Amino acid sequence: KSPEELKGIFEKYAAKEGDPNQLSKEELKLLLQTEFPSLLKGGSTLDELFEELDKNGDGEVSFEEFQVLVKKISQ
Numbered sequence: 001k002s003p004e005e006l007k008g009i010f011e012k013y014a015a016k017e018g019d020p021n022q023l024s025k026e027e028l029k030l031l032l033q034t035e036f037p038s039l040l041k042g043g044s045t046l047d048e049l050f051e052e053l054d055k056n057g058d059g060e061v062s063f064e065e066f067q068v069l070v071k072k073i074s075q
Contacts (some may be wrong), residue, residue: 001035003070009035010066022060025050039073 010023013031017024023031028050032040040049053061053068061069 001073006066006070007063010063014060014063018060022058022062023066024060028053028061036073042072 009031011020013027013034014020014023017027025046029040029046032046032049040046042049044052050061051057053065055068056062056065
């Protein structure tokens with residue numbers, strides 16, 4: 001992965017729902033399962049993770065909010 005690849009996959013997935021800039025809980029779950037099947041679990045539920053990421057509580061994880069996911073997987 002890399003910022004470019006992450007943005008690419010993010011956008012590619014996102015595009016099927018909400019808006020290319022925003023991964024819905026569903027689209028997020030699809031991405032997560034594809035890219036990070038293990039890490040997505042970690043020690044929390046999809047709901048908890050989703051909430052943690054979408055701090056803004058708009059309904060989707062924006063590319064901005066997704067940086068938290070990037071940070072988590074990096075760490």
